[PDB]
Design a protein around this ligand. Sequence first.
Ligand SMILES: [Cl-]
Ligand SMILES: [Cl-]
Length: 57
Amino acid sequence: SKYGGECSKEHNTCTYRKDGKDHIVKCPSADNKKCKTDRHHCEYDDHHKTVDCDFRK
Ligand SMILES: [Cl-]
Ligand SMILES: [Cl-]
């Protein structure tokens, strides 16, 4: 249920792969969910219907 991708710091977006296609969604603006490092991991959780762009590198 989790779909991984990479985030854009400038745009605060997550690009993730699901069902053969790349999808670009906004990250949250929350302090510890936003995209902090360009091109680092993000995930769309299709169970919870949430996005997180702040992972440990
Ligand atoms: Cl595509
Ligand atoms: Cl969200």
